[PDB]
Amino acid sequence: CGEQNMIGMTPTVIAVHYLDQTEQWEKFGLEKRQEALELIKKGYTQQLAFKQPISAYAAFNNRPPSTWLTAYVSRVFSLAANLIAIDSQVLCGAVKWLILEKQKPDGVFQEDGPVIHQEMIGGFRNTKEADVSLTAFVLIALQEARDICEGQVNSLPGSINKAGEYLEASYLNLQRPYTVAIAGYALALMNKLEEPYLTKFLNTAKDRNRWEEPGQQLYNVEATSYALLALLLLKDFDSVPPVVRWLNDERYYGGGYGSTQATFMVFQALAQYRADV
Amino acid sequence: CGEQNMIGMTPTVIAVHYLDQTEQWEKFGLEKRQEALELIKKGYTQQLAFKQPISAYAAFNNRPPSTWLTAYVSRVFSLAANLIAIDSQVLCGAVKWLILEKQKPDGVFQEDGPVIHQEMIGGFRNTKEADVSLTAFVLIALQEARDICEGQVNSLPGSINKAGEYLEASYLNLQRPYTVAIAGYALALMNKLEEPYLTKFLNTAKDRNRWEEPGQQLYNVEATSYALLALLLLKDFDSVPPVVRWLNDERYYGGGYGSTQATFMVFQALAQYRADV
Numbered sequence: 001c002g003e004q005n006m007i008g009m010t011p012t013v014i015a016v017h018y019l020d021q022t023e024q025w026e027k028f029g030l031e032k033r034q035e036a037l038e039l040i041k042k043g044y045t046q047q048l049a050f051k052q053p054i055s056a057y058a059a060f061n062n063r064p065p066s067t068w069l070t071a072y073v074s075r076v077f078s079l080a081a082n083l084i085a086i087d088s089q090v091l092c093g094a095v096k097w098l099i100l101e102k103q104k105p106d107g108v109f110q111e112d113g114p115v116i117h118q119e120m121i122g123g124f125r126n127t128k129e130a131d132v133s134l135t136a137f138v139l140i141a142l143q144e145a146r147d148i149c150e151g152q153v154n155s156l157p158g159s160i161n162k163a164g165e166y167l168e169a170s171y172l173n174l175q176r177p178y179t180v181a182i183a184g185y186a187l188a189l190m191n192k193l194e195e196p197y198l199t200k201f202l203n204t205a206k207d208r209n210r211w212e213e214p215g216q217q218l219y220n221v222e223a224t225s226y227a228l229l230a231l232l233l234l235k236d237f238d239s240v241p242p243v244v245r246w247l248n249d250e251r252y253y254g255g256g257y258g259s260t261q262a263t264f265m266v267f268q269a270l271a272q273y274r275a276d277v
Numbered sequence: 278c279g280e281q282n283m284i285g286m287t288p289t290v291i292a293v294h295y296l297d298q299t300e301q302w303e304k305f306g307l308e309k310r311q312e313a314l315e316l317i318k319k320g321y322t323q324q325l326a327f328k329q330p331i332s333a334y335a336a337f338n339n340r341p342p343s344t345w346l347t348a349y350v351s352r353v354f355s356l357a358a359n360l361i362a363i364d365s366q367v368l369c370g371a372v373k374w375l376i377l378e379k380q381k382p383d384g385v386f387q388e389d390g391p392v393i394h395q396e397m398i399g400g401f402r403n404t405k406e407a408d409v410s411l412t413a414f415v416l417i418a419l420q421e422a423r424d425i426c427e428g429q430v431n432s433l434p435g436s437i438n439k440a441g442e443y444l445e446a447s448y449l450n451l452q453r454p455y456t457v458a459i460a461g462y463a464l465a466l467m468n469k470l471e472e473p474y475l476t477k478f479l480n481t482a483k484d485r486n487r488w489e490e491p492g493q494q495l496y497n498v499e500a501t502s503y504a505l506l507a508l509l510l511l512k513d514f515d516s517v518p519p520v521v522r523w524l525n526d527e528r529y530y531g532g533g534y535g536s537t538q539a540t541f542m543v544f545q546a547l548a549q550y551r552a553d554v
Contacts (some may be wrong), residue, residue, distance in 0.1 A: 001430040008285070008532075010532070011530065011531065011532030011533040012532075012534075015530045015534070026492060027492065027494050028492070028494045028495075029492045029493055029494065030492075032396075032534075032535060035396065035534060035535075036533075036534040036535075039534050102328070119309075119312065136429075147485040213476045215303060215304065215305070215306045215307075216306055217304050217305045217306065218305075220527060233506045249525075252531075253286070253288065254288065254290045254529075254530060254531030254533065254536075254540075255285075255288030255289075255531040255532020255536070255540060256289045256292040256313075256531065256532070257289045257292070257312060257313040257316050258309060258312075258313075259288075259308075259531075259532070263531075263532060274295040
């Protein structure tokens with residue numbers, strides 16, 4: 001089904017990205033990379049079977065589309081476009097649908113068809129501050145789709161800016177570390193993570209190494225990974241080592257029930273850290 | 278298919294085991310355990326669809342059975358029998374088939390139907406010393422099946438001892454750290470890891486923290502995890518901390534292409550370490 005395929009695909013996509021960006025295939029085995037790529041190609045192809053005529057996705061072709069899932073497909077495909085051949089008409093069709101059907105005038109993205117596999121959406125599963133969680137998530141996916149799709153979808157910069165302005169308007173009153181972290185990264189992507197929003201972002205971390213909610217280990221890995229990406233964009237390299245250390249000590253249970261966002265984000269964030277430093 | 282289902286199942290089975298044995302659900306979220314169990318039940322049920330009338334397994338019901346895969350199903354089901362209800366007639370039927378069809382008079386187990394997914398078998402994929410790799414692997418699976426199956430299959434102790442005597446006969450001449458590690462654990466399970474075999478086992482490790490082959494990160498996590506289980510059986514607690522530290526620093530890429538044995542074994546070994554110490 002169209003959700004599980006993305007669950008299945010995620011760890012290998014982001015493992016190949018990480019090994020590539022950190023240049024760590026000698027220890028891993030460079031002869032292993034091509035078989036990993038073949039698995040990513042199979043995942044891509046299988047996912048196309050769940051693309052609806054609208055270019056959006058759901059678990060089944062008969063199920064009404066998920067905003068979240070469509071944006072996750074955009075997130076994964078955008079990154080995977082550097083590993084395997086991906087049809088921009090498929091990727092950018094999903095982008096177009098997100099903006100033209102699911103974004104409200106205030107910039108918020110709405111989910112009309114929640115995913116079945118609620119464990120694959122990370123901290124968004126806690127519905128507190130959900131309009132921020134989802135709008136930040138979709139904004140980041142759209143930002144990641146810009147390289148390929150900004151030319152094909154000229155509604156894309158305006159949609160990003162509107163989502164970003166919503167997040168700015170919402171940021172100082174957020175109570176969740178998860179939301180301060182993911183929206184923090186969304187704001188940093190548009191160079192809006194400045195005072196007074198920056199104090200809010202930094203003050204929310206504990207022991208200057210994590211953005212933590214109680215009893216939510218995998219949400220916290222995911223949140224802290226978004227925070228790390230923001231600190232890197234800020235070029236705040238003084239603040240990075242404790243965050244990297246904490247992340248490397250965490251169990252994230254890749255391939256395990258509920259680990260999809262934690263897996264994607266920890267490896268994305270740790271790869272960027274080596275790239276940058 | 279019957280291989281991929283086991284690939285899919287593995288991380289959650291061993292995550293639940295690990296969280297249980299180390300009593301770490303408060304930080305993880307105890308409300309998450311029942312949904313994980315439902316996924317394990319679905320994996321079990323789906324695997325039964327690939328049980329052939331012989332009680333052995335292959336990727337497809339039309340494919341001749343794999344010795345390796347059947348033994349892996351025995352390994353996973355034996356451990357999972359403590360988490361979900363498993364039909365002993367299914368588990369012990371597989372045990373019986375392994376012993377009555379695939380074990381030679383010298384104690385070695387033979388693979389007549391290699392798995393398609395060669396990435397899921399860990400260091401056995403390197404075919405050097407393969408009769409030891411496979412015989413140790415199957416011996417360990419059979420040992421793990423004893424709680425449930427020794428009463429149902431009274432050929433089981435003799436089969437274990439014969440495999441163990443083969444490993445003893447083969448041990449001092451092994452050249453691979455992988456094989457010294459997995460066969461080391463097999464020998465320790467039968468209290469045969471004594472001199473001169475013990476010197477061989479210990480001398481093969483590097484920096485008293487790992488059993489390493491070049492360019493094979495995931496084989497090395499798997500091997501070192503088997504080594505850790507052996508050191509624990511030896512009650513050699515002086516030798517354990519460096520091995521635990523090294524394992525906790527490794528990337529094992531759970532859910533990623535080629536990670537199945539590394540995922541099962543690292544969490545099995547780290548759970549036993551907390552149990553024991």
